[PDB]
Design a protein around this nucleic acid. Structure first.
Length: 106
DNA sequence: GGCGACCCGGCGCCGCCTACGGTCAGTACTACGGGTAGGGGGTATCGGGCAACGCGGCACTGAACACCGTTGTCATGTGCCTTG
């Protein structure tokens, strides 16, 4: 949590370096975008021991959330081809990404 | 003011080996952009199958000489007959 706070501070100094009053709004609408950017980058870059690249990271999170949506809607484990279709990828890429998203066990 | 309690911290330990043990966890997104390790073809260099060309024993063209062996040969010596 506290490292996330520091990374948000980093995004804040970045955003205020790139803010001007020309925008006809408050700070809270401009800075928050860059804070979100910095936190997302940190969570994608230094979260996993076996580091994944950013593109694969968003692949993992998209797969996880859409799979959770499938479970919520259908209430059953969807067929691999079904998940492949909602993702539009192939089943081979599906098993690949599923294996790439594990965590080390101590 | 140093003692004194007490108070707390603070640690530190709590005995030796042996069989097997069962599993799973929630809230971004796109977009570009470079740059690649992988997909291709074509080329230069090194790495295989048949003959290569030696050698050597001996062996023959036997040729040309050598080594005994031999009956060629013979001008020159004994024995009998005729005459001094």
């Amino acid at each position: 949590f506290l490292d996330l706070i520091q990374e948000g501070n980093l995004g804040l100094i970045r955003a205020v370096e790139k803010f001007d009053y020309t925008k006809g709004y408050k700070f809270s609408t401009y800075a928050t975008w860059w804070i979100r950017q910095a936190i997302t980058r940190a969570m994608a870059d230094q979260a996993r021991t076996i580091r994944i690249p950013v593109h694969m990271v968003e692949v993992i999170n998209k797969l996880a959330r859409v799979q959770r949506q499938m479970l919520q809607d259908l209430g059953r484990e969807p067929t691999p081809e079904e998940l492949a279709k909602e993702l539009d990828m192939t089943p081979e890429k599906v098993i690949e990404v599923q294996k790439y998203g594990r965590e080390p066990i101590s």
